[PDB]
Design a protein around this nucleic acid. Structure first.
Ligand code: BEF
Ligand code: BEF
Lengths: 190, 192
RNA sequence: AUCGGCAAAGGAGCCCA
RNA sequence: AAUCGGCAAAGGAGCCCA
């Protein structure tokens, strides 16, 4: 049966429990619940769920603004709204902040589980791309700092690039630290 | 009022294609084509390059899942949303794996369609931005090896520091307003 | 005297019970 | 001497067009 970790957010517990039944029957893990945007933020912060289901109209903080915080900080992998509100203002706001689905009340208990599976998977793949972008842009920070470190080290010692790389390689290995970090220190040095 | 987006509709029951067509046009979208089987679905996407594809699973010739895989992996459309009576667990696994952005179930809840369209269009665009940023970084990381040769040539020929040689190459490439890789190619062939 | 980890792999160093 | 746009940098503040 289905696999995924889910957080449920609505101010009306009646709807919150309808969802809770459907989702657990399908076999997901319901890890937390919230009745307002602040409980929702703190629950996600602790939880790190795969999906957050939430209503726009809540007390304290509408799901739009709480969702904005959730996605900005990356407290959850994917987020899907459901509300009886579907005016274009709320639709644009939800799509801009980065929702992966939006369902209109009263919810289609038939569509829900499929849209859950889609939103979880596309959430994961989006997190993979962000990690690949992070990894590449880091490696491209590293080579710049490394090349600066080669240059400054050659200027101070008056030696060749092979010896400069050998110095960085021996230091990083001896000191159990990335050549990139050693280079950042040496470049800050001058 | 006045939604923007370009859509293609794909189902074997023409009554449902017309019900959908009427809804999306009333919202303000542009329908740019329709199909009634997987083979026309791929061909229409090749021509139109739409923002969103709406398709049933059970279609003749090529099930919507097979056309959906092709459309996604060749990027013939920026986002894709299924709409079927089939909610079968195997069908949801296939649809999410190939790369759907939504999976509504027949008979459709018309209220829900337009929001899921807007979300799926935006998520499709954003996913293509991220893929473009990956292509740009990985290219610029390959340019580095040519730039590192051009740097080495400057430090020898001028008899200067690495930080001075890069500062020269950068100020040159900005002055001549050309990609450092292009200036690096010119220098490295000039030494040859 | 032995196990484990980080770094390097343009390698073969370092730390811990 | 200034502003609009564009190219390139971003290991940054540089260059072209009205
Ligand atoms: F508060 Be939800 F919009 F029912
Ligand atoms: F008729 Be399709 F399978 F929804």
């Amino acid at each position: 049966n289905m696999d995924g970790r889910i957080v449920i957010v609505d101010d009306e517990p009646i709807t919150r429990l309808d969802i809770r039944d459907i989702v657990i029957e399908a076999g997901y893990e319901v890890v937390g619940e919230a009745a307002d945007g602040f409980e929702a933020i703190e629950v996600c912060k602790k939880t790190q769920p795969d999906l957050v289901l939430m209503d726009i109209q809540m007390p304290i903080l509408d799901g739009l603004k709480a969702g904005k915080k959730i996605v900005q900080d990356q407290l959850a992998s994917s987020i899907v709204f459901l509300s009886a509100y579907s005016d274009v203002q709320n639709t644009d706001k939800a799509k801009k902040l980065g929702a992966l689905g939006y369902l209109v009340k009263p919810l289609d208990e038939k569509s829900l589980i499929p849209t859950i599976e889609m939103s979880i998977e596309r959430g994961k793949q989006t997190q993979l791309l962000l990690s690949q972008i992070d990894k590449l842009s880091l490696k491209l920070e590293e080579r710049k700092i490394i090349e600066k470190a080669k240059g400054i080290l050659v200027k101070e010692n008056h030696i060749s690039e092979e010896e400069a790389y050998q110095m960085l390689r021996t230091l990083s290995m001896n000191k159990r630290a990335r050549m990139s970090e050693i280079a950042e220190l040496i470049v800050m040095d001058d």
